Amino acid sequence: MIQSQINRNIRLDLADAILLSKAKKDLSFAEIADGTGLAEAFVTAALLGQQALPADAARLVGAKLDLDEDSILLLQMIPLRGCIDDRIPTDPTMYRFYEMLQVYGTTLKALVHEKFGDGIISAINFKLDVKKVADPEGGERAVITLDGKYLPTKPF
Amino acid sequence: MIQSQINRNIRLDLADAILLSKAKKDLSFAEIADGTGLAEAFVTAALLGQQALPADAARLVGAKLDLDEDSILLLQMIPLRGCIDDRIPTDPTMYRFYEMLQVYGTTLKALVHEKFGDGIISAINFKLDVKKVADPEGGERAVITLDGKYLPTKPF
Amino acid sequence: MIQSQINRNIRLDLADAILLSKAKKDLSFAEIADGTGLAEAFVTAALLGQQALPADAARLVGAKLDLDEDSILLLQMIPLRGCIDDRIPTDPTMYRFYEMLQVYGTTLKALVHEKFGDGIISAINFKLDVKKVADPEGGERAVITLDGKYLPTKPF
Amino acid sequence: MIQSQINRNIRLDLADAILLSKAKKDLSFAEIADGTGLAEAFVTAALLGQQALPADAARLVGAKLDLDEDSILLLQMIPLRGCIDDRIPTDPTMYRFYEMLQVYGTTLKALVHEKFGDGIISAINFKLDVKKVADPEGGERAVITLDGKYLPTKPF
Amino acid sequence: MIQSQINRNIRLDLADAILLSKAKKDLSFAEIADGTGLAEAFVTAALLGQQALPADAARLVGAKLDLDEDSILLLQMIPLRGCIDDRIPTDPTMYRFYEMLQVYGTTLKALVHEKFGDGIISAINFKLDVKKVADPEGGERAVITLDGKYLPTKPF
Amino acid sequence: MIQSQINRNIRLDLADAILLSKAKKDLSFAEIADGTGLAEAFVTAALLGQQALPADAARLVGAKLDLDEDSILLLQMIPLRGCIDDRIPTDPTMYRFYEMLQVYGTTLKALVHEKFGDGIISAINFKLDVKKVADPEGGERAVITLDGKYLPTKPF
Amino acid sequence: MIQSQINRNIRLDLADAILLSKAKKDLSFAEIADGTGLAEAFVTAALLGQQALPADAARLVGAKLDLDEDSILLLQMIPLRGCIDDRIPTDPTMYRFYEMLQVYGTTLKALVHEKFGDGIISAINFKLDVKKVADPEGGERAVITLDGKYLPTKPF
Amino acid sequence: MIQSQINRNIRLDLADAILLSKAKKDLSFAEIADGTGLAEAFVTAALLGQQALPADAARLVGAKLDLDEDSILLLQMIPLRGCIDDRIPTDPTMYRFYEMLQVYGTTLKALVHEKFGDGIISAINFKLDVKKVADPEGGERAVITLDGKYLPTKPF
Amino acid sequence: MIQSQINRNIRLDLADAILLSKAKKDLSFAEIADGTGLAEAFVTAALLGQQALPADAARLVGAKLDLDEDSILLLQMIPLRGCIDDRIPTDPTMYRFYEMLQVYGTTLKALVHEKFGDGIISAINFKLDVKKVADPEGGERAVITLDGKYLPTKPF
Amino acid sequence: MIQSQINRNIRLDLADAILLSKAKKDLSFAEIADGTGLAEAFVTAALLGQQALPADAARLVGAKLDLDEDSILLLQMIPLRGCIDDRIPTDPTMYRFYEMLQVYGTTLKALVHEKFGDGIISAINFKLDVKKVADPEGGERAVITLDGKYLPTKPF
Ligand SMILES: [Cl-]
Ligand SMILES: [Cl-]
Ligand SMILES: [Cl-]
Ligand SMILES: [Cl-]
Ligand SMILES: [Cl-]
Ligand SMILES: [Cl-]
Ligand SMILES: [Cl-]
Ligand SMILES: [Cl-]
Ligand SMILES: [Cl-]
Ligand SMILES: [Cl-]
């Protein structure tokens, strides 16, 4: 039977415990996800409180991080999502994604409406991934791909 | 000489006027950007007050929308950026991008640090684009690509 | 070509003018929507700045309300949605719906997860209606039906 | 003698303990409410800190979840209601109900005044329920019924 | 047909015009409400944007204040209520009533639940009045009576 | 010597302990205040952290609730007042008193200035009480009396 | 008959026009108050929207500043007080008195309770003045004296 | 070597421990500060987390209150100042000082600029004291003296 | 006689008018400040509403921007300072200086107390400047120098 | 493998423990950074939770502060940055840097665009230092140098 949380602090506290175990073992997110059959972004988001693992994955990652049974159970609960402490991020890495919305949010709305129509690009029928690509001018770039279904607003 | 603004309401009120003129002419953002040499996302963001157009582009779009000389001049001023009325969007279309940040912000941080290092993905050396494609299960998806330079945080 | 707005106050000022015209004519929202083919909640929401009308419906309601051509065109533009002035309503009628969320929001989350699974009930593939019924104990009751598609959250 | 609470954290802490017991026992909210004579939405809201259980229901659910005597007494206290952590939900499932108010809140106002008159639809002489319905286009929909008494505002 | 507003600034702008007319004419609220059949607190609240007047009272107050026909019409519309500019009052007179809630709000909750039960004292089925009483230690006291219907919360 | 607090959470923690003791003993606030010579609204407010009890009343209530000597001392300290968690109540019972201010707060200002003059009705030279009265139409009403000294604002 | 305001912006806009006129005439607050019989702090506060002037003073300062009849009338209304734009001042000169409260607020509470007892120092039966004194180490000091009645909180 | 703090909660927790000790010993702030050669407002503010005591004063108060060595050391640390829990006080005693700013803040600004010039009255080169004196009309008044250095703002 | 403002919108509206004049004339801030005898950062801040100009500088810049006589007088008024629209900047250029304080604010505090002692680095006995320096790894850097007097906090 | 945090409180609690260790040892920040090869501002920021230390510097500062292994490991984790408790500082020393932004933030924007172009000065390719110098008028000054790379915003 599905089980769900109503207070994010329980899963976020567990995420802090998971990160200390991870660092003591000198593990990467890529190696924790490897073998689960699940994408690294999904498994990472679950460890950080924002997705629920299926039971087999929760046991797999639980063994790798030496978690106890209550923590393996908690990773399978549907979370009360929301990773930002107080609405706007303070951390510079996270903030730049907020700034992208402050600069391009109205452009994203306008172009979605022109290409698709009235309605939204979903954050639920949705996936994202992060890739590193060489910059031809030197250094490295991240290409982050947001891929969401269009859901139309029609008249009723 | 470069010229800059300190109150966003001047360019946002210009954007409202632009959009009325666009609608009376039954124009698209794609056709407005046609012939400028510049990407639709960048041009549209300038119309909506979030970027500056080079003089030639400003004249080109200004002839298409029948703008007066002060409006063409304002399009070339560096803006006081920030398109969200009050920190969190109310509009559903814009809000889903904010929800992507509430659900995957910490994951984006974690995977950026693992793949690149300490530091940021820039929102300045940065480009974005929106493509429409079919969904293999039916309907349509948006693939939005955020492409920013990695800038490292190093000890000093 | 679809056209969209980025500042809610244009459509909200139109809504105030619509209301004054409506009052001078002693019109009801039911009679305004009559003839359009569209549900009274959807037409009323467009008048109040939260939906877009198709052209024929815009022209029809525009004739009933004596609207000018710029107003008719504005009702066809996709709005920057968000009807609450500052996040939490002050008006008692609207505030009771917010209070329903404060009392039952976590119960709605828990029972949506038990009945459907992880994911959301959509606010976009969605219809609402308000029906007046008799209260068998005396008086009248509103039965407000929120009818949204279940969109699952699945691992990837 | 009726007893009441003044700080929500006592019952919300109890709610987190209840959810952990429920998960360990792999119980559903439907099974917890069975035998009580009360609707699942009501009993679930009480477990989550937003309603008071009558003594016999408190003892029933208490035995199912192996709660101690103080927890069984706290479920009978009238709560300090308010389930949303900080005014606007961050959780997607909960946020969509908030977005329904941002899009349709003024329309609910307008139609309540047209159909009933000045006043409110109560959140106190009130009930809700959640039903699952097949969608004809594929998938499932939730039909969430809000059913409140009209209470008039009259001159004095 | 009943008519309702969705932005409070229309009626609050009206209230400022009413106050200027009232001051130029050197009228009291008591004299304005005289002849309407309605309590001074209700008529005053309507002038200040927070209640609707029946048409005969709107016409009577409109004559006294030399209002125009659109303003007499606006006074009959059901308002978007909420008189405090930004949630907590700044004005000392208004603030003391907010302070009474900061000091005694939990006591009011507790004594309402003990004397009546679970539920609320209504702000809709509700009257208030302000009376001036001599203080036996010297000076004057205000006795403000809040008189609301008890509406119970019961299981379903 | 008089002693005063600066962190509300000490007294609010004590309040929660008091309410648990009170519920275990099945006591009423009227019976706790019986024998103190003090009004039930004042005594209840002290229990809930918003007033100080004189030492004899603190020992009297402490006997009835079986409080330890540290708790009886704490009830005599002058509190850091403010019972609302975060400015606006979430609880429906408390909220309706806030809604009375949002509806009538400008009316109370205007009528206090008309009846008394510039200045305020005190919240310190002040008493409140709650009475239950039958409603002639059926049911029960609360009559809450707010009785405050008028303090004038004069030029100097 | 006393007249009062509900929107501070009318008197704050008046204040801006008063200050322009004062600057064009190169007047000081001291000379505007000289001759009224009223303290400079009280007259200045009225000009700035935070007190009401008696009619003779309003005519005197209105002649000095060349105000029109509507402005002289507005100066006599009881204001909706609160001079800070958005709760915390941005201006450095004002902010330092807020910082006094952040550093010493609990000390003021503690010393008021020690010296006087439970209750408050009034902001209504209250005067302030500002004096310039030489600093013996060099330069100048402002001695600002806040002089308020103690009003006791007593049990009832 | 001077030592500083970055989290106010350490010293505010000390303050709560100090006030419990003080109350158990039935001590006054006047007596705590006696012998220290420092003003009672300065010593009190250090106890409550808002100033640092020189080492001899720390030792001497620590003796009176029986503090442990981590607490006598902590009193000498430079605090992270800010005594108001959440920007605006809820306690009535503290709030009246905030209300003095809401009423007279712009008057204080205007009179400081006229009497001294552009710049500030310092909150750092600053002393405050509270005196109790009789009111000539009966009762008692607080005379609170804010004495700060003028620091000019001049061009560069 | 010195003159001061109390609402920032008068000077910020002026700044917008100055900026439009500047752009029409294609002037730089360096050239506007030329001839004034004042630093470019000071003069620019005055044009943007955050400092006052002496009369000869105001007349000089006024002639270069073709300002009217009331504008030239406004530039001499002491401003109600505070350039950030709503506490945290949205503009990326401005936000990076805020992010410096989120990352280094507690380090600034720590190192100021270490090197100087308890007290502050002034923002009034203060100057800043911006210099462009080549980066040896390519490109350019800004060296922004904040230079403030240390003002100690001493016991009294 | 690089490791990162997502909740600032883990490193901020570590900072508080580091500060108590430092105070017991009578250590300076300059002494703690000595021998690390890293600037005191960077090492002090790491101790306070806002930067990561390389492993050899972590071990070195850990030896000086008697830190346990988990604490040395936590200092090497990439932090969730953000040192201000709630957006605007309360502490006077911190606040003056914020005030520098409220007074000069728009001037910094204007001058960066004039000297460099559209774009930002980086807070990531960035160094800061604090230097104490004599004030030639008497006393001491801090010279705080902010040195960041200019990153241009160009059309795409
Ligand atoms: Cl979605
Ligand atoms: Cl960036
Ligand atoms: Cl949705
Ligand atoms: Cl209700
Ligand atoms: Cl109600
Ligand atoms: Cl009072
Ligand atoms: Cl008062
Ligand atoms: Cl200062
Ligand atoms: Cl300063
Ligand atoms: Cl940056």
Side-chain angles (χ1 to χ4, degrees), chain D:
Chain D
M1 174 68 258
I2 193 162
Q3 302 297 322
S4 62
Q5 291 281 111
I6 66 156
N7 157 37
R8 69 177 178 173
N9 290 333
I10 295 301
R11 283 286 289 284
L12 293 182
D13 286 343
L14 174 60
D16 287 340
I18 289 172
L19 297 173
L20 179 63
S21 179
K22 175 175 180 283
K24 287 182 173 168
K25 300 175 183 42
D26 197 28
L27 297 172
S28 59
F29 287 113
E31 289 167 333
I32 292 161
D34 280 335
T36 60
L38 297 182
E40 194 185 0
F42 184 83
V43 175
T44 300
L47 297 178
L48 306 184
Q50 305 307 316
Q51 297 288 175
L53 288 174
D56 290 337
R59 285 191 286 264
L60 193 81
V61 305
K64 295 185 174 179
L65 288 165
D66 193 39
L67 300 186
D68 64 23
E69 290 298 312
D70 278 2
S71 305
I72 288 160
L73 182 63
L74 284 172
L75 287 171
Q76 290 169 249
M77 305 198 50
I78 308 309
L80 189 302
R81 295 176 170 91
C83 76
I84 301 177
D85 181 53
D86 185 15
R87 294 165 187 197
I88 307 307
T90 56
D91 181 67
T93 308
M94 295 174 65
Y95 182 84
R96 298 306 181 276
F97 291 97
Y98 176 81
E99 182 167 279
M100 297 164 197
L101 187 68
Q102 277 285 187
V103 175
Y104 285 98
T106 43
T107 293
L108 292 167
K109 178 178 173 69
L111 297 182
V112 165
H113 296 317
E114 175 155 308
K115 294 171 188 285
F116 298 91
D118 194 0
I120 60 166
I121 299 314
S122 192
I124 295 293
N125 181 338
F126 177 77
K127 67 170 282 200
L128 65 80
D129 80 93
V130 179
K131 298 205 171 215
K132 165 191 261 190
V133 301
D135 190 322
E137 296 167 5
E140 297 169 333
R141 299 189 73 83
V143 178
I144 294 169
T145 294
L146 316 171
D147 180 354
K149 196 158 184 203
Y150 171 58
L151 304 174
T153 279
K154 293 168 185 315
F156 52 93

Side-chain angles (χ1 to χ4, degrees), chain H residues 6, chain J residues 8-20 46-49 67-68 70-76:
Chain H
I6 62 163
Chain J
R8 67 181 179 173
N9 287 332
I10 296 298
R11 283 287 292 280
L12 295 176
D13 285 349
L14 177 56
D16 294 333
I18 284 171
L19 296 176
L20 191 57
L47 305 174
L48 300 183
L67 303 185
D68 62 16
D70 284 346
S71 292
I72 290 173
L73 184 66
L74 279 173
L75 280 185
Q76 295 164 252

Side-chain angles (χ1 to χ4, degrees), chain A residues 87 114-115 132 147, chain B residues 29 98 115 132 141 147:
Chain A
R87 302 174 177 181
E114 176 153 308
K115 302 179 185 286
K132 166 194 289 169
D147 175 1
Chain B
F29 293 110
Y98 176 81
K115 293 175 181 292
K132 176 170 60 181
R141 302 188 72 84
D147 171 4

Side-chain angles (χ1 to χ4, degrees), chain G residues 96, chain H residues 120 151, chain I residues 120-125 151, chain J residues 96 99:
Chain G
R96 300 310 180 268
Chain H
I120 63 161
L151 306 183
Chain I
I120 58 166
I121 299 310
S122 191
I124 296 291
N125 188 333
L151 307 180
Chain J
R96 299 306 184 273
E99 185 166 279

Side-chain angles (χ1 to χ4, degrees), chain F:
Chain F
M1 171 71 287
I2 193 161
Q3 306 291 324
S4 61
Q5 296 279 111
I6 67 167
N7 171 12
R8 64 182 180 173
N9 291 326
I10 305 312
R11 284 280 301 277
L12 297 180
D13 286 350
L14 174 61
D16 297 331
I18 286 167
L19 293 174
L20 183 61
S21 166
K22 177 174 175 282
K24 288 170 181 186
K25 295 171 175 54
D26 198 37
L27 299 179
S28 69
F29 288 109
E31 99 189 79
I32 291 159
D34 182 64
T36 59
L38 301 176
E40 195 193 357
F42 180 85
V43 176
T44 300
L47 302 178
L48 302 185
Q50 304 305 320
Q51 294 296 175
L53 286 181
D56 288 345
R59 280 187 290 262
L60 292 174
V61 312
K64 300 185 162 145
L65 291 160
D66 211 22
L67 300 187
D68 66 18
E69 294 301 313
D70 279 38
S71 293
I72 287 162
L73 188 60
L74 280 177
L75 289 174
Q76 293 165 251
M77 304 198 57
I78 295 180
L80 192 302
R81 294 171 168 96
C83 79
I84 302 174
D85 176 58
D86 183 15
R87 300 175 182 171
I88 306 313
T90 57
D91 182 66
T93 313
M94 295 176 61
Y95 185 86
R96 295 314 179 271
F97 286 96
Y98 174 81
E99 181 169 283
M100 300 161 195
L101 299 196
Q102 278 284 187
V103 178
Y104 289 104
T106 50
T107 294
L108 288 162
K109 178 183 174 64
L111 292 187
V112 162
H113 296 320
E114 181 156 301
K115 294 181 189 278
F116 296 91
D118 198 355
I120 58 168
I121 302 306
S122 189
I124 293 293
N125 185 336
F126 175 78
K127 68 166 279 183
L128 91 186
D129 77 279
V130 181
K131 291 209 172 183
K132 167 154 57 31
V133 183
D135 195 321
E137 302 190 355
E140 288 165 340
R141 304 187 72 83
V143 176
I144 293 126
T145 299
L146 310 173
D147 171 0
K149 184 80 179 294
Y150 167 58
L151 311 175
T153 281
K154 297 154 185 304
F156 52 92

